[PDB]
Amino acid sequence: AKSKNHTNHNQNRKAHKNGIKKPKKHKFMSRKGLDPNFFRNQKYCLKGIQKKKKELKLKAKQEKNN
Amino acid sequence: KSRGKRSGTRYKFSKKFRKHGECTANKYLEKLNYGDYVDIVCDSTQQKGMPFNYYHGKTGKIFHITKRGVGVLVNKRVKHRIEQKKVCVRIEHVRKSRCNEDFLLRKIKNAELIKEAKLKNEHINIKRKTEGPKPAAMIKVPPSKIITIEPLPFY
Amino acid sequence: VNVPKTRKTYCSNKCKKHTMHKVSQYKKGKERLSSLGRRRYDMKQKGFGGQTKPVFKKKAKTTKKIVLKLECTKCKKKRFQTMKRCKTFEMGADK
RNA sequence: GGGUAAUUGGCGCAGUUGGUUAGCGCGCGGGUCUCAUAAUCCCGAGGUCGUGAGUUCGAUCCUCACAUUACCCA
RNA sequence: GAUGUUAGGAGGGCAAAUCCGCCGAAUUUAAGCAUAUAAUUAAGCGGAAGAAAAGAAAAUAACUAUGAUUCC
RNA sequence: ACGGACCAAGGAGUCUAGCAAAUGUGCAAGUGUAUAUGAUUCUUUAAACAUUUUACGCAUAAUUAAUGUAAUAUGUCUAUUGUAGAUUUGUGCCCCACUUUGCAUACAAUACCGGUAAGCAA
RNA sequence: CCUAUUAGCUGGUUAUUUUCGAAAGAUCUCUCAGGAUCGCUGGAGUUGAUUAAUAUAAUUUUACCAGGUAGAGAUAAUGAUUAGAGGACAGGGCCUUGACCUAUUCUCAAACUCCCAAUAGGUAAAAAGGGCGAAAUAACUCAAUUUGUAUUUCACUCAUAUUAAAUAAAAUAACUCCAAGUGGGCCAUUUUUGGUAAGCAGAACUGGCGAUGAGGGAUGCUCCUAACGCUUGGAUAAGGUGCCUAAAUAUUCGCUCAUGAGAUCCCAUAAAAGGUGUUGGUUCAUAUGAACUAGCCCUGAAAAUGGAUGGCGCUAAAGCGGA
RNA sequence: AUCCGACUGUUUAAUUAAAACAUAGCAUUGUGAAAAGCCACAACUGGUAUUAACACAAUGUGAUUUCUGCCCAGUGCUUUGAAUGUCAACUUGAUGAAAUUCAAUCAAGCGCAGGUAAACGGCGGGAGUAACUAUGACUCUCUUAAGGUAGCCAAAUGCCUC
RNA sequence: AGGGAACGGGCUUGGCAAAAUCAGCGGGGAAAGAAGACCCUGUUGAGCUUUACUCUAGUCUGGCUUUGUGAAACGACUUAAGAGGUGCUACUUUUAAAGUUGUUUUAC
RNA sequence: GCAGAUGUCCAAAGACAAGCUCAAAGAGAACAGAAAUCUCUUGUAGACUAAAAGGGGAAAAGCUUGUUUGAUUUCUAUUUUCAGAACAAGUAGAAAACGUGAAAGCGUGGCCUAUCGAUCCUUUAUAUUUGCAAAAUGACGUAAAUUACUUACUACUGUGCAUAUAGAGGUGUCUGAAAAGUUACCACAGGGAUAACUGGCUUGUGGCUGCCAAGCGCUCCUAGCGACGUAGCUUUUUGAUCCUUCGAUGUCGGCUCUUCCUAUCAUUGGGACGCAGAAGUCUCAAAGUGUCGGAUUGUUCACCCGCUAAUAGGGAACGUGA
RNA sequence: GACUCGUUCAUACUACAGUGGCCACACCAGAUCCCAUCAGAACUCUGAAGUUAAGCACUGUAAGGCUUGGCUAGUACUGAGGUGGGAGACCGCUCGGGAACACCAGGUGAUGAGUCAU
Known part of the structure; x- marks a missing residue:
């Protein structure tokens, strides 16, 4: 027999029953496919920063532990 | 279709x-x-x-x-939830949004007000005023200015 | 659809430059009786039971996708390029 | 797709390295009287392209073009 | 080769749960159905034992190698 | 619209296999003692009890069609890095702001393993 | 006998209370009486909150966005479309017939637009952050190892004592797992497509019915009030107060006489056209003549069992419109 | 008097007794025999057949009378073929180290060429035209394998149609 | 009468309504029968038909085997020579009847 | 539902750059005309841009010319549909190598919105990647040593097959079975999710009643009519719908019998007339009484013969099959 | 007075008319070279005799257009409520929002960086 083809009835009620969920909005987004030659350089920056910081901390630890 | x-x-x-x-x-x-x-x-x-x-x-x-392009993150309502959508467009199709300009001006002005207020050791209200009911006023008006209004007849 | 017989284009194997390629049309080539699928099909078709696999007979479309065989004139390495489907296709016809 | 033949005059037609030939269709002359008909002549990319070879439509090759048989696992 | 109421013997039928040969479907599943599945099953025919059948390598491995069959 | 004249009794999500989740329990990088054996056990007992210091399953490592290859890396018995974050430590035994520590987890970033690309390739 | 074959189909499916509580959309499907998968729902659990905050919000304010529906227009474009007015290419007999141009003019568009609402929609409104500086790092960027960019570390400090606008039984949150039912819908208001129309077919928003009783609408799945533990009082809503029937034959002011009066949304039909019935207004003519106007009433107004403002009945209403 | 069936006969046991079936008559087809025709059977073997063309088998039509027209294009059935295209297994040959891969040929069938309608079946349309009108003997034209012939009819067959 | 799943015995508003019985009757009980046989749906069937798909008995034909004993003819293969065009050599034809095989006929 | 369009087309109609400006109109120039070419003026696109339509486009996205193959290989973040799966079609990028331009730049097909396809199988390309389950096959290759089962070192190792990756061969019912009919002999599971009948709503159609007045009626709109228009009633026709019934509401007509309506055919009493009488027509109150015999047809309907005073129209589940 | 590169992209456009020139723009002289064509018209190159005639700048017009305001007009339309009116079509009321065409009036630009001349 003929079928009710379509209706949006009650769909808004269903949607609002569990609220209109919002995205979680995390602090950090993955940089997988964004601006290469920039995020690679950022990787180099961060590597150098860790190298210098860790070597300073290691120098302090060695001079404090004798 | x-x-x-x-x-x-x-x-x-x-x-x-x-x-x-x-x-x-x-x-x-x-x-x-x-x-x-x-x-x-x-x-x-x-x-x-x-x-x-x-x-x-x-x-x-x-x-x-x-x-020559911008990827901009836009909220889209899909049935029962909003979700984030990364839309990639060219420069011509994008323009700087003024949705923030009142907030930015408020930040600058309020900072340069708070600085002077703290300098003078004063307590101020920095929040927006959401102005409501007006105070009583004691107004004067020439008698030749009051005009009598009555509903007009039909024509 | 007219396509010139030769084309100076990127070589994707054994060379990484833009070299001259000779262009031709790919042809299906005959199915061999020793292929695993054909052997399995023949063994299945043996005996009683009649036809054992579907035989397609709808044949909706009328043309085929055109595939160009590009052969680099330096490394003699063949490469495939797919053209949009068309009814008439000539290679190196009059300009 | 496999195997076969074909399309050369306007018609039909067979013919292959020192070759485009004919009957019918067309044009006049002349004629044996009125036809016939000797003969000249109109009619040929020898389907199309490429290739082989002192000497090819011709020999090889590919393309679509037609007609029986036959194969029809996405 | 026959033929023998020559002498002495054997087979035949019943019974089947397990067992050994043959013959042999379709219902069903695939959400249809034809290969496939059901199933080398049911039905059918024949043949034994307290068990039957298998069994003493024309086997496996590829290892420092194992050693009939059956069953867990 | 269909079933039901009445009464009694019977009458329908169960059993097994296999998987997962949940929760409880035991042990824990191990766990389960399978088949089987022993042993003054032999009504019960067809259950209980036991197993001379690499059987097997699952887990402990992944990835690739595959030959296969296989997780920081010996400067350090340190144990990758951030932002939040529980708990802890002190100063203003009962508030909070600064320090201190930084679980779980979330969001990222890094290394490293297998495969594929790309570059080189004795 | 295989065989208790198969059935997306019909029928049935057995104690109580309590708590939570749907869908009849959507995508794919040899799919349209089915299924899977989202959505809606329960149970379980953790992380949080428990700090009249923050997260948060079917809400508003402030700031800033996007639109081309309603409306408007035809002289703004396109498409139509009625008339004339003025003014130098063509036919015949200085003239006639027009065409054409200019300025006008009547009327229109879901697939027209110069313009353009209401409603609906989006983003933002500070602490894991912002501002301002220094110092490091990079293979990036730049003419720039000191241009910039980003990151990191140090500084200083940006309302919080009401909380970077308001309001909020906002943490009754967020997340994860497992799973049921459902996937024939229908109705009302508003909008709208097809249709002459339909208790018709198809859509949009919200609310309901389903899944839901209670008071009222006499009666009624969907109307109004209002949603529900068991009671005692009080006071109301909707609606009523002549009797049926609890409460006014209440008060106050008009209108109406019907030889088929009229009497509560949905709702249970009534029209064009008329009236020298009566009531009240408006505009013209010397308290007369006219023409209008709109209240109630009347004609228009005919159907089959006997008959229905719900019934009785009601006219100094128990009718109509008020207070 | 009309329709149908010639007649006698038979039939749907329990809704149809007939115009249905059968029938004699007519016509067609196959077959000369145990290597035949038609049919049964798993095989062996068998029925017709204790038969032999005035026979057996397979069909259609349905007494008599008078007839039984045209079409072999289509589909069937059937007849001839070393001129004949196509084809399987096999066989032969070539290549290869071999598997294989390539080629080549005297089957049947189809195709080709015929025959056959008491085989299935089929069997047309426009205009113009005769001293009134009407009609169209006649003519032109398109077209088929053939264009429905002799007959018969609003028939148990004609809608329109009472 | 109304409303209602749009034709009530029950509901609402009315009309009404007085025990028990006998005999008829066919308006109603949308009376009884009986999971509608028509129609549609089902990825449920079955009978039947075909130039539906896929098969199959039968039948026609070919190959191999059974299958023995002879003769003849023809063809093919192998081998020696001649001729043709022809780059120590490569291809076509003819000549023998020389050895091998196949076919067609025929005899027992 | 409405107006349409697609299963294509293009070595340029793709890429880049430069130059130019189009349709049309007016005026002017031998042949030469409404149209043929040339010049000038105006010219916001009224042209053109492959195709449908809608957007976009003027030193261009159009026309012409020049040079080209970016219509190339690989990989991400993603948008549309949406389950936020796939295909497909796009957007923004990155790593190569190129084209174009003086360059900045632009180019990963067509100015944008459509122009298309899973598994399995096949096919052909690529590969210093692999396998064919006890082994070998380039090759005893290169160096030494002797009469051997000598020793070291080599990216490149047989046919066939299979694999990995990438295109292609197609499923248009386009998320993708290999598929003709008939049942009037029929079966089953169901369906009022769905037809054939009543009933119900609507009333186009059918029937009936109004309003206006151009005309007809010798003159005269309205005695009687009434075109062009327009307002209603009825369910006595047929439609439209599919609301109820498919575990069954007996579906035509006639006969029989009763009752009801009035939109009255006759009979009763009136009014009007284009009413002399007669006959008749229009109309009012009125449903008390009555509305027939036959031929043909199954008929309803119809049509004739005849009587009559009149032979009116309808309803009751198309009244009425225990 | 001026020019170059821009911004706004008509208050900046269009038509007609008037005024202005020393370098400044430009018209203008020429074709050997670079270059370009049918055509030194354009483009390109080399110039400096002539001229504000034009471009350009400024102004004017009961100018068209464009733009701002008023007015159209609380009109049209519209969100929420109504056991509101009306047989309906439609139309009020309460709490709110609120156009457009036309017509009238004013206006016809402003400006960033740099440079030249006096």
Whole structure:
């Protein structure tokens, strides 16, 4: 027999029953496919920063532990 | 039966009266930075990098910048939830959003007010005023200015 | 659809430059009786039971996708390029 | 797709390295009287392209073009 | 080769749960159905034992190699 | 619209296999003692009890069609890095702001393993 | 006998209370009486909150966006479309017939637009953050190892004592797992497509019916009030107060006489056209003549069992419109 | 008097007794025999057949009378073929180290060429035209394998149609 | 009468309504029968038909085997020579009847 | 539902750059005309842009010219449909190598919105990647040593097959079975999710009643009519719907019998007339009484013969099959 | 007075008319070279005799257009409520929002960086 083809009835009620969920909005987004030659350089920056910081901390630890 | 990319955009993607023609040269000088809000208005004169029908007139913050394009993160309502959508458009189809300008001006002005208030050791209300009921007023008006109003007859 | 017999284009194997390629049309080539699928099909078709696999007989479309065989004149390495489907296709016809 | 033949005059037609030939269709002359008909002559990319070879439509090759048989696992 | 109421013997039928040969479907599943599945099953025919059948390598491995069959 | 004249009794999500989740229990990088054996156990007992210091399953390592290859890396018995974050430590035994520590987890970033690309390739 | 074959189909499917509580959309499907998968729902659990905050919000304010529906227009374009007015290419007999141009003019468009609402929609409104500086890092960027960019570390400090606008039985949150039912819908208001129309077919928003009783509408799945543990009082809503029937034959002011009066949304039909019935207004003519106007009433107004403002009945209403 | 069936006969046991079936008559087809025709059977073997063309088998039509027209294009059935295209297994040859891969040929069938309608079946349309009108003997034209012949009819067959 | 799933015995508003019985009757009980046989749906069937798909008995034909004993003819293969065009050599034809095989006929 | 369009087309109609400006109109120039070419003026696109339509486009996205193959290989973040799966079609980028331009730049097909396809199988390309389950096959290759089962070192190792990756061969019912009919002999599971009948709503159609007045009626709109228009009633026709019934509401007509309506055919009493009488027509109150015999047809309907005073129209589940 | 590169992209456009020139723009002289064509018209190159005639600048017009305001007009339309009116079509009321065409009036630009001349 003929079928009710379509209706949006009650769909808004269903949607609002569990609220209109919002995205979680995390602090950090993955940089997988964004601006290469920039995020690679950022990787180099961060590597150098860790190298210098860790070597300073290691120098302090060695001079404090004798 | 028809759901093409540009279906139903007869008027939305049409140029305004006497405002046809390519984008102005000065628009290419617009300065864009990561994380700032941007409006998505489709410029029909530029076909490549055109946003989808839905996002025309929406706002979102930039999450990616390329040589001639911007990836902007836009909220889209899908049935029972909002979800984040990364739309990639060209420069002509994006413009700096004024959705923040009142907030930025408020920040600057309130900072330069708070500095002086703390300098003078005063307590001030920095929040916006949401002005409501007006105070009593003691107003004067010439007698030749009061005019008598009565409903008019039919004609 | 007209396509010139030769074309100066990128070589994707054994060379990484833009070299001259000779262009031709790919042909299906005959199915061999020793292929695993054909052997399995023949063994299945043996015996009683009649036809054992579907035989397609709808044949909706009328053309085929055109595939160009590009052979680099330096490394003699063949490469495939797919063209949009068309009814008439000539190679190196009059300009 | 496999195997076979064909399309050369306007018709039909067979013919292959020192070759485009004919009957019918067309044009006049002349004629044996009125026809016939000797003969000249109109009619040929020898389907199309490429290739082989002192000497090819011709020999090889590919393309679509037609007609029986036959194969029809996405 | 026959033939023998020559002498002495054997087979035949019943019974089947397990067992050994043959013959042999379709219902069903695939959400249709034809290969496939059901199933080398049911039905059918024949043949034994307290068990039957298998069994003393024309086997496996590829290792420092194992050693009939059956069953867990 | 269909079933039901009445009464009694019977009458329908169960059993097994296999998987997962949940929760409880035991042990824990191990766990389960399978088949089987022993042993003054032999009504019960067809259950209980036991197993001379690499059987097997699952887990302990992944990835690739595959030959296969296989997780920081010996400067350090340190144990990758951030932002939040529980708990802890002190100063303004009962508030909070600064320090201190930084579980779980979330979001990222890094290394490293297998495969594929690309570059080189004795 | 295989065989208790198969059935997306019909029928049935057995104690109580309590708590939570749907869908009749959507995508794919040899799919349209089915299924899977989202959505809606329960149970379980953790992380949080428990700090009249923050997260948060079917809400508003402030700031800023996007639109081309309603309306408007035809002289703004396109498409139509009625008339004339003025003014130098063509036919015949200085003239006639026009065409054409200019300025006008009547009337229109879902697939027309110069313009353009209301409603609906989006973003933002500070602490894991912002501002301002220094110092490091990079293979990035730049003419720039000191241009910029980003990151990191140090500084200083940006309302919080009401809380970077308001309001909020906002953490009754967020997340994860497992799973049921459902996937024939229908109705009302508003909008709208097809249709002459339909208790018709198809859509949009919200609310309901379903899944739900209670008071009222006499009666009624969907109307109004209002949603529900068991009671005692009080006071009301909707609606009523002549009797049926609890409460006014209440008060106050008009209108109406019907030889088929009229009498509560949905709702249970009534029209064009008329009236020298009566009531009140408006505009013209020397308290007369006219023409209008709109209240109630009347004609228009005919159907089959006997008959229905719900019934009785009601006219100094128990009718109509008020207070 | 009309329709149908010639007649006698038979039939749907329990809704149809007939115009249905059968029938004699007519016509067609196959077959000369145990290597035949038609049919049964798993095989062996068998029925017709204790038969032999005035026979057996397979069909259609359905007494008599008078007739039984045209079409072999289509589909069937059937007849001839070393001129004949196509084809399987096999066989032969070539290549290869071999598997294989390539080629080549005297089957039947189809195709080709015929025959056959008491085989299935089929069997047209426009205009113009005769001293009134009407009609069209006649003419032109398109077209088929043939264009429905002799007959018969609003028939148990004609809608329109009472 | 109303409303209601749009034709009530029950509901609402009315009309009304007085025990028990006998005999008829066919208006109603949308009376009884009986999971509608018509129609549609089902990825449920069955009978039947074909130039539906896929098969199959039968039948026609070919190959191999059974299958023995002879003769003849023809063809093919192998081998020696001649001729043709022809780059120590490569291809076509004819000549023998020389050895091998196949076919067609025929005899027992 | 409405107006349409697609299963294509293009070595340029793709890429880049430069130059130019189009349709049309007016005026002017031998042949030469409404149209043929040339010049000038105006010319916001009224042209053109492969195709449907809608957007976009003027030193261009159009026309012409020049040079080309970016219609190339690989990989991400993603948008549309949406389950936020796939295909497909796009957007923004990155790593190569190129084209174009003086360059900035632009180019990963067509100015944008459509122009298309899973598994399995096959096919052909690529590969210093692999396998064919005890082994070998380039090759005893290169160096030494002797009469051997000598020793070291080599990216490149047989046919066939299979694999990995990438295109292609197609499923148009286009998320993708290999598929003709008939049942009037029929079966089953169901369906009022769905036809054939009543009933119900609607009333186009059918029937009936109004309003206006151009005309007809010798003159005279309205005695009687009434075109062009327009307002209603009825369910006595047929439609439209599919609301109820498919575990069954007996579906035509006639006969029989009763009752009801009035939109009255006759009979009763009136009014009007284009009413002399007669006959008749229009109309009012009125449903008390009555509305027939036959031929043909199954008929309803119809049509004739005849009587009559009149032979009116309808309803009751198309009244009425225990 | 001026020029170059821009911004706004008509208050900046269009038509007609008037005024202005020393370098400044420009018209203008020429074709050997670079270059370009049918055509030194254009483009390109080399110039400096002539001229504000034009371009350009400024102004004017009961100018068209464009733009701002008023007015159209609380009109049209519209969100929420109504056991509101009306047989309906439609139309009020309460709490709110609120156009457009036309017509009238004013206006016809402003400006960033740099440079030249006096």
